[PDB]
């Protein structure tokens, strides 16, 4: 069904020694396809997925011009925010930006986003209407007023509804074979005796894509979240993902518990049991 394209940007000041670290990264769905790092020798936007290598020199030149511009605005934003919040030059701060669009299974525009954060706290965000801004505090309200007069929302709407989508489609058609694949998780269960009176059952999902997944445990067919543990979905280093879910149970009662796994590649979900 749905797909997304997402660009993320991070600048970090370095009070001591020169200009800020700038790192930018682009994704479609859960696949990184592009990157820039102000500290790398190349000083160029670099490919990070095979299917983007096809694109021609004009493309990489254009993208490079623009990431550099983005980093410049961040460079000045750091100074601007030190002013707004009245902070010293001592101490390192962080500006972050993300933007992108979503499309549905029909590949029509579904939703757009554009947000900033200062030191890990929401600063300003475009609202779902793409006309209006959410501004955290006096500082962010200053920015909001600046942007209202400079017609930034219009600039963003035009990108998010048009360009963002047209290029998302283009990407999904080149390297169709990586981005429109679904790899159903390979699954299995393990058992470990915790103590004399109990045991943990751990339910595994491996080698799957995309990352969205749901692992659920039941007892006698009733949803259980008491005495369960989930781990954050994590990358195997090869384009796929991993997750496990564990529950601790009285020993001798393993048969009463089942693990249910839901994923795009499993239209009918799996259930697993401890085979003694």
């Amino acid at each position: 069904g749905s797909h997304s394209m997402r660009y993320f940007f991070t600048s970090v000041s370095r009070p001591g020694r020169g200009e800020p670290r700038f790192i930018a990264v682009g994704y479609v769905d859960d696949t990184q396809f592009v990157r820039f790092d102000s500290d790398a020798a190349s000083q160029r936007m670099e490919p990070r997925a095979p299917w983007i290598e096809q694109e021609g020199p004009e493309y990489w030149d254009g993208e490079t011009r623009k990431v550099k511009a983005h980093s410049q605005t961040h460079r000045v934003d750091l100074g601007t925010l030190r002013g707004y919040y009245n902070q010293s030059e001592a101490g390192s701060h962080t500006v972050q930006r993300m933007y992108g669009c979503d499309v549905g299974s029909d590949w029509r525009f579904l939703r757009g986003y554009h947000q900033y954060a200062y030191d890990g706290k929401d600063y300003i965000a475009l609202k779902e209407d793409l006309r209006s801004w959410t501004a955290a505090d006096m500082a962010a309200q200053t920015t909001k007023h600046k942007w209202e007069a400079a017609h930034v929302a219009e600039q963003l709407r035009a990108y998010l509804e048009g360009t963002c989508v047209e290029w998302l489609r283009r990407y999904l058609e080149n390297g169709k074979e990586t981005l429109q694949r679904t790899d159903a998780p390979k699954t299995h269960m393990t058992h470990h005796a915790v103590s004399d009176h109990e045991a943990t059952l751990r339910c595994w999902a491996l080698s799957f894509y995309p990352a969205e997944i749901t692992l659920t445990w039941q007892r006698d067919g009733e949803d259980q979240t008491q005495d369960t543990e989930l781990v954050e979905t994590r990358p195997a280093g090869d384009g796929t993902f991993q997750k496990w879910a564990a529950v601790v149970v009285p020993s001798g009662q393993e048969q009463r518990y089942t693990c249910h796994v839901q994923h795009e590649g499993l239209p009918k979900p799996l259930t697993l049991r401890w085979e003694p």
């Binding site: 993208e63 983005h70 000045v76 600063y123």
Partner: peptide, 9 residues
Amino acid sequence: ILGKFLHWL
């Protein structure tokens, strides 16, 4: 593709 964005906070 990146937005053609010259925006300052």
